Amino acid sequence: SPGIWQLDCTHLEGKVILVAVHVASGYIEAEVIPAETGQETAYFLLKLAGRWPVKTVHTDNGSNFTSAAVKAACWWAGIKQMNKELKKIIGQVRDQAEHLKTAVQMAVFIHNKKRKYSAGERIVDIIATDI
Amino acid sequence: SPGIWQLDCTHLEGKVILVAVHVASGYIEAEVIPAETGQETAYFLLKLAGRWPVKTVHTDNGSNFTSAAVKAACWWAGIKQMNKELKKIIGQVRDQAEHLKTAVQMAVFIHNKKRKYSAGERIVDIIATDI
Ligand SMILES: Cc1sc(-c2ccccn2)c(C2=CCC(C)(C)CC2)c1[C@H](OC(C)(C)C)C(=O)O
Ligand SMILES: Cc1sc(-c2ccccn2)c(C2=CCC(C)(C)CC2)c1[C@H](OC(C)(C)C)C(=O)O
Ligand SMILES: [Mg+2]
Ligand SMILES: [Mg+2]
Ligand SMILES: [Mg+2]
Ligand SMILES: [Mg+2]
């Protein structure tokens, strides 16, 4: 189902990586954030919601969604309540970049454009079909 | 044509807002950045390219694309070489949020979800059709 996303943080090199997965397609978005915080999660969701039709969000750590900032974002945006494979791609391109955040975006790109249709194509097809 | 984007910075409240427009649909993405820098532009393009099939980019200030970091991102990602309407929506929601960056994302959301099909639907349709 096309409005469902998964959202979790992983850790790498002492930093936090917020990873959203469009469950039906396997498409990902990710950002490196300073701290694993309710506020950062909220802002992330705002950005995600303006880009895709986000209806429901799941997580492996329910306590992530407990902050008032997060609930307020989900309220405003109308939302209701890979990390190993990505680390793999991060590892493969890590040395081409100085900043971890740059390596993460390189990795997100590679993940979304690979065929094994790519995740990037499937999200768009699934969502266009739903219109 | 579906792989064409426009990219420019505007200024608001002493900060820089990077605005990308998918020309065929009018869909936007935007971020608040510390400084109008080649490096920030590069990183922005990396993120944009992993999310959408970006083929060519235009700007109103050609000197934006002059930094080696920018050319290197366009090289890696395979890329070749609204601000008033968005400010309008920013103005309308500005008071609901503390941080400008939050108001910008609120505004991007409102811009992409409005019908006047929304920009958000058209990008996806145009791109799915192209697959
Ligand atoms: C901090 C820097 S400098 C720099 C670069 C690369 C070539 C020429 C000049 N600058 C790069 C690049 C490395 C990877 C890419 C794909 C080639 C994009 C540009 C970076 C890159 O940081 C950015 C993306 C914030 C600029 C990095 O983390 O290494
Ligand atoms: C710095 C803060 S705190 C906060 C908030 C709002 C309600 C309850 C608790 N926190 C908010 C919110 C205001 C707008 C939204 C749509 C309701 C999302 C959450 C903000 C918001 O910053 C965030 C998005 C980085 C957290 C802001 O700039 O005001
Ligand atoms: Mg988690
Ligand atoms: Mg909170
Ligand atoms: Mg400009
Ligand atoms: Mg440079």
Backbone angles phi, psi at B11, to 5 degrees: -120, 140
> Edge-to-edge strand order for the sheet containing B56-58?
B27-33, B15-22, B4-12, B56-58
B66 within ligand 1 shell (Cβ under 6 A): no
- CB atoms B46 and A128 under 8 Å: no
Q: How far is the CA of B131 from the centre of ligand 2 (A)?
A: 38
The token duo for B1 is: 């044509």
Q: How far is the CA of B70 from the centre of ligand 6 (A)?
A: 7
Q: b/e string for B78-113 if b means 16 or more Cβ within 10 A?
A: ebeebbeebbebbeebbeebeebbbbbbbbbbebbb
Cα A91 to chain centroid distance, Å, stands at: 18
- Domains of chain A plus CATH, in order, are 1-131 (3.30.420.10)
Quote the CA–CA distance of B94 and A43 in Å, as a whole number. 15
- CB atoms B46 and A131 under 8 Å: no
Task: Please tell me the number of the ligand nearest to residue A37's CA.
Answer: 4
Q: In the 8-state DSSP scheme, what is residue B13?
A: T
**Which residues make up the environment of ion ligand 4, defined by Cβ < 5 Å?**
A 38, 67-69
The token duo for B53 is: 């099939």
- DSSP 3-state of A108: helix
Those residues whose C-beta lies under 8 Å from the C-beta of residue B74, and which sit 6 or more positions away, are: B45, B57, B65, B80, B81
Residues A53/A33, Cβ–Cβ less than 8 Å: no
In total, chain B counts a number of residues equal to 131
Interface mutation vs chain A, best among B102, B115, B118, B122, most A CBs within 10 Å: B102
Quote the CA–CA distance of A25 and A122 in Å, as a whole number. 5
The token duo for A21 is: 């997965």
The neighbouring-strand residues paired with B21 are B6, B28
In single-letter form, the type of residue at position B126 comes to I
Quote the CA–CA distance of B20 and B38 in Å, as a whole number. 15
Closest chain B CA to residue A39: B102
DSSP string, B56-100: EEE-S-GGGG-SHHHHHHHHHHT-B--HHHHHHHHHHHGGG-SSH
Q: In the 8-state DSSP scheme, what is residue A62?
A: G
Q: Is A54 exposed, middle or buried (0-12, 13-18, 19+ CB in 10 A)?
A: buried
Those residues whose C-beta lies under 8 Å from the C-beta of residue B21, and which sit 6 or more positions away, are: B5, B6, B7, B27, B28, B82
- CB atoms B109 and A43 under 8 Å: no
Count CB pairs under 8 A between chains A and B: 67
Quote the CA–CA distance of B9 and A76 in Å, as a whole number. 27
Quote the CA–CA distance of B102 and B88 in Å, as a whole number. 15
Backbone angles phi, psi at B93, to 5 degrees: -110, 0
- Tell me which residue has its CA closest to atom 10 in ligand 2: A69
Cα dihedral across residues B34, B37, B39, B44: positive or negative: positive
Q: Is B53 exposed, middle or buried (0-12, 13-18, 19+ CB in 10 A)?
A: middle
Residues A131/A3, Cβ–Cβ less than 8 Å: no
- CB atoms A106 and B76 under 8 Å: yes
The neighbouring-strand residues paired with B16 are B11, B33
Cα A131 to chain centroid distance, Å, stands at: 22
Measured from the Cβ of residue A117, the count of other Cβ atoms closer than 10 Å reads: 11
The token duo for A98 is: 């100085």
